[PDB]
Amino acid sequence: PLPPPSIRSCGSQQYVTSYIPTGAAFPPSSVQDMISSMKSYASATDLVRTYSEIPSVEEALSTLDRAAAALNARRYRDALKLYLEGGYAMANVAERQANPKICNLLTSKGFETLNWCARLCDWIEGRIKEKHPRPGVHKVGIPVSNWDEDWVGPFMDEEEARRMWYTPVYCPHPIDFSNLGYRLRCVETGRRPRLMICITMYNEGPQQLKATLKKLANNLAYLKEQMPGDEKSLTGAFAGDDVWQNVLVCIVADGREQVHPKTLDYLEAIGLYDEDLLTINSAGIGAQCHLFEHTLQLSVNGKCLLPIQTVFALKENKASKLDSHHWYFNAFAEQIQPEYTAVMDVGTMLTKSALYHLLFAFERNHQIGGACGQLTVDNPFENLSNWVISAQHFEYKISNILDKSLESCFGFISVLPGAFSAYRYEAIRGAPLDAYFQTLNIELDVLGPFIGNMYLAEDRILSFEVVARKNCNWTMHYVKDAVARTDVPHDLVGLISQRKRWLNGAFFATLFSIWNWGRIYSESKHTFVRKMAFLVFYVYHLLYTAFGFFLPANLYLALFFIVFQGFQQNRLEFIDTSEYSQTVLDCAVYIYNFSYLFGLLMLIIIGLGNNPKHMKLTYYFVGAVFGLMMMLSSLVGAGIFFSTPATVHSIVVSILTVGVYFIASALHGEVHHIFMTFTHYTALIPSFVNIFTIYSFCNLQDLSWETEKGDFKDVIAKRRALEELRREEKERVENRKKNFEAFRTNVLLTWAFSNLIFALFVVYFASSSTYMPVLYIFVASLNTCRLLGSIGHWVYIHTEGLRGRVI
Amino acid sequence: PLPPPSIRSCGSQQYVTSYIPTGAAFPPSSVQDMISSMKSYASATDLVRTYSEIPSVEEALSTLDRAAAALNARRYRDALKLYLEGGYAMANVAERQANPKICNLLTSKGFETLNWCARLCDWIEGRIKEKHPRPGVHKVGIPVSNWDEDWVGPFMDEEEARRMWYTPVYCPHPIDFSNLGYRLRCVETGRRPRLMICITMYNEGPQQLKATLKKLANNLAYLKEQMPGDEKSLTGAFAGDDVWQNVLVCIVADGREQVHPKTLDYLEAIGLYDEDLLTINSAGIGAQCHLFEHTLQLSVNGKCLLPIQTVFALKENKASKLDSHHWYFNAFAEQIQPEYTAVMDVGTMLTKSALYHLLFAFERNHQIGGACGQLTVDNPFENLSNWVISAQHFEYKISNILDKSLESCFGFISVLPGAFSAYRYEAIRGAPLDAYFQTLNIELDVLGPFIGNMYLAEDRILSFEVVARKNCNWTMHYVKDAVARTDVPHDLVGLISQRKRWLNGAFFATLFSIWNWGRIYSESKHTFVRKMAFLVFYVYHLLYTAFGFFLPANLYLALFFIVFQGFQQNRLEFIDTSEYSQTVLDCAVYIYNFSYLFGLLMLIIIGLGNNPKHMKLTYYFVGAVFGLMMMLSSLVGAGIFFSTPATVHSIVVSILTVGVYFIASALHGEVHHIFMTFTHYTALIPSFVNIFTIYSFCNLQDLSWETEKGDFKDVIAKRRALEELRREEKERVENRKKNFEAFRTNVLLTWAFSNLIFALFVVYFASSSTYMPVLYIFVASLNTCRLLGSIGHWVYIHTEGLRGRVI
């Protein structure tokens, strides 16, 4: 027992040294005397009280946010106190404001907060039994700021025409959207739309959204304009004068931080967004996302389009596109219960007939479980001086025609991103969607790296699940007339990144399909003929994948043998090289080999090294070298072919190898595009193969993703527990990244060394006369099969319409 | 003007829809009537009041933390209110506690907080003029928990012996440590230590720290035990019976999160840490770091060591080691103003004579601006079955002897990490330290990538700045007898990482030195003979660096030519290969080339791909292959040399190439180590060169690093400004990373392609009879120069002691 040290200025002075003896426990009387001998504090207290006299909006919002954070932490008394303080603060502040909208919104928010406080107090007392109590749902409808008086439509109720509705949601698991008591305007008003469209958006300019909305309005107008009484005309819910009431459009953004500000300005202009309402009404909830609802009316030039029922959902935090599809499908589809479900991106500009053709196919066939339309490049002929655009145009046309026709003949399509794809909401409701969202429900550690890698491009999983669903026989189909025009990158780097993601997804989806093909026979219920056809397609798929795996080696072998060994060993027919100094003959081969090897080494180093945006010059240089090489090879090959007097074998091989493209293009009426873009596509084949495959394989690493009071010892334990949990989480993340990197490295090494070993063995132990015929036979077989598939698809599409009466 | 909608249950019910008309502004009377018609809130209010009756420690600490955060944000009224609330809460809570220490600490903290509140109120009123007001400094001394009664020392004041002191500091820029009013116990008590030691620590076990402290105590004991009256004995402040008062030890940790808990337990055991004091006294300050001060007494077995004056500084957030050196040097050196300054790491176990030899050299020479001791591996002979440890032991011995002697002859040393290095605090005070910490004061964007890369290993910058300081002639020196024993990794992967950082730092420091060598002649003031000697050393340095840049190609050429082309073209002398099938002769060369190329490709892919921890098996396999190849080459070369009848040229070349190691080792008396470890080191040369250089060059990417009230529009503007600032920061970070990656990729490509092109040209346009003599001449010249340097250093060290009387 000793008096405290005589130090009354601890924070007043600059530096003070003191000694605090522990174990004495002090006398209470001395401490009380020390406390009573201080009078300055009163002044400070008075000042603080004066400062505390007046509240402010910022303080109220901050207190409400802290209350929400406490409520999420399961501490209820502190949440109640903060909620009461915030409610009283807002109620007091609301009178100061001079803007009527702010005054009304603040008054409403204060009343809601006070009612929630009363309900929470009643629950804490034990009067009401609930689990996870939350503030009640309260959607607010307000007049639209700008309204076009000079607009003519079919008919619009004033409540629907001039009021926009808003509500923030908290639902953490989207499957519980309906249980928690949320509702939509369409369901509330009694309308039951039959078709739904999802338009995912992330970091886009207003122009793309404007074009997409205009095109959708044009499609609705065309659907309305069709006359009844015809065989072609649709019957039922898609007739005229009421079509706009059976279609709903959902616009799902990805995150408030990443949204382009001009997009928000445009959305607010058309009456679908308001910052003040979001700021005020979302204070206490801690919403996961906020949804606005309207029936927007658009006017372009002097023509007024049709009204569109629109729901705009904006998520609070950035997530994957699969998360947006999860929200859309589960919440909105399970609530509305539509019949069809269309998926597209932002910027996809449809033609006037896409919806009509899709609905016509779905209604006529009754066996189609899904459909995809044709994809096209916007303005291909304009600016033909650009080679990348022309190459992409040729690739799209040929891929569509040949591959899509061949795959749609058998009734199984591997849709390529990002198409405008429609599924009927009866074949995907159960197991297929469960397998679709498996990544979002299970952490990557349990699944493994192989399962996680394939979901980067996730459409093919849905396609395969629909085709092989248990106790059902669902088949897919391809519609030629559903044309969707997109925009393509103008440079190499964006194309490289896009092809990287496409190739990763395609490769691992193909591996999964080959692994699990047996489920069609083991579980599904198809016809026997369908099973035999699927077996034949399986054999073809295996052969095609195996040939595509060894493509760089085959390209190198073909170029080397034909061109350079013809020059060296005098096999070019239009010139004789028995002369010359025996130095040029070897020099050609040496130059070719050294250039090819150095280019491959540089490309792999750069691709595995850094992002392909600050290495533009090197990629351009390598592409130019490879393009010049390919053009030289093409000219030499054409000369060699023309010089030969020709034979039946030669002409048959030439036809079945090269002319299949032109024959199939002429059969379907699209021949001029091939003529325009064949030369441009020919000069990018080595670039395509080498660069895109190497960059895709190198960057496979791109993985995605309660005590109120207390004493001192509790504080120490809490801090230690938090530190332990943080360290364990960091360790787990490290382990996951290590596993994924190891897997990608093993795959890349296997691929590269397989190609190199095959090339070396074929070069050293084979001749140019015992190898080329095998390659010719293989290529001819593949192209013959593709041509037969295309012809079969054309015959079916032009015959079934007339011959379906019998069957 | 319309009445509010009749909705009194907004959060009470599950789901309610409402319409809020904006622009009406409401009637006040209706809102007042609606408010007055509610009575449930009172119950909630009462409950809240009851819950608010009792305070708690956690609430007080949280409020103080929020007050500190507000004060850092330049808002003063909110900070004052929160500080007052926290002070009153702590004052009320202090009486509840039953633990006397907690009661006393809480009472003191409450009084300090109230005094700071009063001072801040006075400042806000305008009575006091200050800039950046902060709470006053207040260091607290408390008794040590555990005290050893059975301990005998020279003499200790009870205040110093039984009290440990603590204070948290806020100084954001360490240069202002003295201005803000902080102080140290040694300076306060009047002691003026002359020598300082810094012991950096980060994520280490207690055993290393215990061993380091025991070794330092042994060094102090040896320094005390020396007798006076001898020529060898030191004179002055380092005499006997008072040596322990002239040495201070600073232990700087790197971050509370990363510190091993057992290390904290051990530190608390010896009376240098306490969690309760840190938790309580650091609540309001928002300290950058916390420092404890003591004079610790250690006992090992039955012998009691000497007391050590220790200051333990623990930083709040993790930073680089350069940050720890910044804090140490600036704050503590500028305050204490010592004479010398020693730097070491944790785990470096000194011998009994290191300090004596260092101080002896510094006092005798009077021109030495810095010195470094010899580095050794602990227990080399024990567990000789391990090859990595033996290879490292041989490398350390040879590097020390040859390179250090040669460089110390001229008076310029490039110290290798991490040595026990001592600088006198007179040649580094000004410009050298400014150039040392240039990275910490200027962001990497202004400097560029080349400047930023070299500071990864930062000692050589200090060495060069000391050597070339303006208007001064400072030279460095190497002491052979200052032996420091460390611990080395037992596996390949840790060695790989350590060598990666070492090689990056060494390469870029060497480039900087070669770039800026001219400053010695342009600015410094040396003797003419010194300038000529530095010119000669510059020529030698350029030649050595140029030879070392092209090492992999030379190794490949030597192995290939000698061994495999001797086997193929019958040049092995102990066997004739004119027989055989002409298939084996080519097969040997083909196998060698293919294996070498495949190994290099795999190594570069793995090194650039992933972290070298989950690729252990592949690295081990490649190392084993290269080791077997090197052993075969060594045996073949030994046989070839022994078979030859020999000549003057042959014996001279053999001596000057290989036997220089043994001659120099025998000259200095350390010969058995070479005999033991030569075989182990021979089998790791290709592994060293290839693996370490490739991994070092691949991973060069490793870069490091106010309105109180308000209205609504201010809130919106604040949110928009914060979003804009965040996006700009993200863009800047992206740009910096892009630039660094591009630089590293360019350097790697240059190195690899230079080596490959040189190798190809020499293989194709040269013979094994017109190339090997040049290589022999080059290697012989370099080794002759190194041997001459070593002999000169030995002669100087054994002669100057006797011959210094004349000069």
Author numbering:
A (entry chain B), B (entry chain A): 38 to 742, 759 to 860
From the reporting publication:
Here we report five cryo-electron microscopy structures of a chitin synthase from the devastating soybean root rot pathogenic oomycete Phytophthora sojae (PsChs1). They represent the apo, GlcNAc-bound, nascent chitin oligomer-bound, UDP-bound (post-synthesis) and chitin synthase inhibitor nikkomycin Z-bound states of the enzyme, providing detailed views into the multiple steps of chitin biosynthesis and its competitive inhibition. The structures reveal the chitin synthesis reaction chamber that has the substrate-binding site, the catalytic centre and the entrance to the polymer-translocating channel that allows the product polymer to be discharged.
In the apo structure, it adopts a conformation different from those in the UDP-bound and UDP/(GlcNAc)3-bound states, with its carboxyl group pointing to the substrate-binding site, which may facilitate the recognition and correct positioning of the donor substrate at the substrate-binding site. Our PsChs1 structures revealed that the entrance to this channel is blocked by the swinging loop, specifically residue Pro454, in the apo and substrate-bound states, but it is open in the (GlcNAc)3-bound state. Although TM topology algorithms predict IF3 to form a TM helix, our structures revealed that it actually forms a bent helix parallel to the membrane, as suggested previously for Chs3 in yeast.
